[model samples]
Target: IPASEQETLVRPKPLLLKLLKSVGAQKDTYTMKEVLFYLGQYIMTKRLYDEKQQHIVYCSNDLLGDLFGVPSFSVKEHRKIYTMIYRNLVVV
Candidate 1:
């Protein structure tokens, strides 16, 4: 499945809705811990099941460009941000 489908695979809207209800565009106002907590829920729930294949599924520049509303750089360059975050929560 494509990166776009990854989050939707788990029907993340409810989670997202909960986040919206709890945060309400206050991401800039929220503490890093709070933001990460909600974002982490989305990440963990929507993430790929296969460990090795997880890298293949996310943070493609095209996908990020669409998501962040900014033209993405090389996905390969910054993919560590995702991998590191993943590793922080899920052990190899």
Candidate 2:
């Protein structure tokens, strides 16, 4: 396969927990910052379900926020969170 068409297999749940626990251990308590970091990691790593594509990258604020006990975060902020995570993963 061409390099341009290459993709990676990302198992998100285990990866999220691993990253979260690493951060969680250093803190007094889990905060919304940690929640966002883990949630964004999952979104960036996982392959969401969709028929039109082989791998679908999809997530919503409600879905991620609810998982981490975050009642809410503004959509504008969420975009920044996602971009920060997605960008850094690519660089690494």
Measured by TM-score, the strongest candidate is: 1
Cα miss at 67, model 2 (Å)?
5.1
Q: Give the TM-score of candidate 2.
A: 0.27
Off by over 4 Å in 1: 1-28, 48-50, 54-65, 69-92
- In terms of lDDT, the best-performing candidate is 2
Tell me model 2's lDDT, rounded to 2 decimals.
0.42
Q: Please give, for residues 1-92, the per-residue lDDT of candidate 1 as tens digits.
A: 23542232122223333543443453223333443455544434555222455334343333222333333222244454343333323221
lDDT of 2 by residue, 1-92 (tens): 23321233222344344555543453323334555555555445553323344443344543444333344333346454454334323221
Which residue pairs collide, candidate 2?
A: none
Per-candidate Cα lDDT values, in order, are: 0.36, 0.42
lDDT of 1 at 46: 54
